């Protein structure tokens, strides 16, 4: 349908880097506000799994995020705040919402 | 001390996704009349459209994993929703930070 998607990022974050990774999150989040085509960015942590979390970010469409925010400079710089942080790459999917 | 959401990751099998969407639906009451529980969302993959992810607001917990699972509603969401279906749904909690 025509409207807004979700891309789903499910992060593993590095043993003890918690703290380091939603700090720098939380400085990073503008980043994602300013990004065209950009209405939101959340961040859940897993309680079964502590250094599991999920990043959820508002899109207009899908290549609003993985041609526009990926070619832009706020994208290395997201990767230069939070990168170090991760165990390996996360898993990233995009979501439309049926009910 | 605050909401959690379940997060249910579902695969459904070839050509049952409507079928599954209109159960999902039809449980919307077995789901708001459960303890605990403030909302049920249901949102479907782009990459892979056969995969779905429920996401459940409850207070706590035990909500979803004692009182919904041991009781007589979580059989009735089984009945409406099971045979769709691919193999057993991967369930989670989450909690939001920011």
Redesign the interface.
């Known amino acids: 349908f025509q409207g807004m998607?979700?891309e789903?990022a499910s992060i593993l974050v590095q043993p003890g880097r918690e703290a380091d990774f939603?700090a720098g999150?939380?400085q990073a989040?503008p980043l994602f506000m300013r990004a065209r085509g950009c209405h939101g960015?959340?961040?859940?942590?897993?309680?079964?799994?502590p250094q599991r979390?999920?990043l959820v970010v508002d899109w207009e469409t899908?290549d609003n995020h993985m041609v526009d925010f990926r070619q832009s400079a706020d994208f290395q710089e997201w990767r230069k705040l939070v990168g170090e942080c991760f165990a390996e790459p996360p898993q990233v999917?995009?979501?439309?919402?049926?009910?």
């Open positions: 998607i979700q789903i939603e999150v939380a989040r960015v959340a961040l859940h942590r897993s309680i079964e799994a979390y999920t899908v999917h995009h979501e439309q919402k049926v009910l």
